[PDB]
Amino acid sequence: PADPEIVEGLPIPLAVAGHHQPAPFYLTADMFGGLPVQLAGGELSTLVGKPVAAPHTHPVDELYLLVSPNKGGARIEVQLDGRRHELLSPAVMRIPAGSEHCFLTLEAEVGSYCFGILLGDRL
Amino acid sequence: PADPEIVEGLPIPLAVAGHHQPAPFYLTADMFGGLPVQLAGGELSTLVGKPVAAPHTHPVDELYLLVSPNKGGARIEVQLDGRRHELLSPAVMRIPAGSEHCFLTLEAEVGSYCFGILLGDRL
Numbered sequence: 136p137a138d139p140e141i142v143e144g145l146p147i148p149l150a151v152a153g154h155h156q157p158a159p160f161y162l163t164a165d166m167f168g169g170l171p172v173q174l175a176g177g178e179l180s181t182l183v184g185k186p187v188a189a190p191h192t193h194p195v196d197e198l199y200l201l202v203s204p205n206k207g208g209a210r211i212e213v214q215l216d217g218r219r220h221e222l223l224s225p226a227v228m229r230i231p232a233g234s235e236h237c238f239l240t241l242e243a244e245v246g247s248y249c250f251g252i253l254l255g256d257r258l
Numbered sequence: 259p260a261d262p263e264i265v266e267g268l269p270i271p272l273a274v275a276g277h278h279q280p281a282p283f284y285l286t287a288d289m290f291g292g293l294p295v296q297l298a299g300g301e302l303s304t305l306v307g308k309p310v311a312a313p314h315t316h317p318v319d320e321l322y323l324l325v326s327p328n329k330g331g332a333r334i335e336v337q338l339d340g341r342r343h344e345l346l347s348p349a350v351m352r353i354p355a356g357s358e359h360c361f362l363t364l365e366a367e368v369g370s371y372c373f374g375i376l377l378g379d380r381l
């Protein structure tokens with residue numbers, strides 16, 4: 136009864152440069168015969184003041200998506216090649232391929248999520 | 259002070275066949291000079307027992323991603339060409355291009371989300 140169209144074995148924690156524990160992926164390049172994007176992320180309520188990674192880079196563009204049940208329920212700081220940016224939920228920020236970046240949770244409620252959508256199949 | 263790398267004007271509600279209110283997009287094909295995927299969705303806590311759409315189709319493959327703060331905090335029913343499937347968070351389900359489908363929220367907590375990731379730039 137494993138259904139080839141359904142993946143329940145999630146997240147998929149992958150070692151990523153800059154991270155100190157594996158990053159939680161929900162879409163990987165090897166799913167469903169091959170995907171054109173990857174997607175990692177997670178719930179932020181326990182991460183306020185606790186960054187997941189140091190400044191790091193990807194060979195592909197990556198979009199951050201920040202959501203929370205209440206409008207403005209979550210806020211993150213993003214460093215983009217050394218320049219601080221902030222996002223207030225809901226928001227999306229583009230991180231160009233090669234840009235040294237990371238994010239920090241400054242505010243979150245139960246149900247705040249940040250996802251990174253990697254526009255390619257390599258890390 | 260609009261930053262070209264940040265979109266705060268979200269969601270973007272788009273008219274979609276089968277839906278009775280516009281669907282909330284967070285990534286659209288026209289963002290950042292052109293994106294190769296689109297992404298729509300939202301928080302499910304108020305949607306238990308309330309479907310967003312009738313059976314409908316897309317010209318591209320679409321991946322459902324279901325997450326919730328607690329393991330198993332959310333459950334959805336997906337109809338795939340008339341066959342009922344269920345997803346327990348966290349889960350991902352592939353919906354092939356052309357497949358008549360829809361989902362129904364059967365259980366959700368504060369912070370449950372379902373997103374559809376459309377693998378292309380057309381609807």
Ligand SMILES: [Zn+2]
Nearest residue numbers: 138140341343
């Ligand atoms: Zn099936």
Ligand SMILES: [Zn+2]
Nearest residue numbers: 155156186187
């Ligand atoms: Zn840590």
Ligand SMILES: [Zn+2]
Nearest residue numbers: 193197236251
């Ligand atoms: Zn990154």
Ligand SMILES: [Zn+2]
Nearest residue numbers: 218220261263
């Ligand atoms: Zn800037």
Ligand SMILES: [Zn+2]
Nearest residue numbers: 278279309310
């Ligand atoms: Zn409705």
Ligand SMILES: [Zn+2]
Nearest residue numbers: 316320359374
């Ligand atoms: Zn659909």
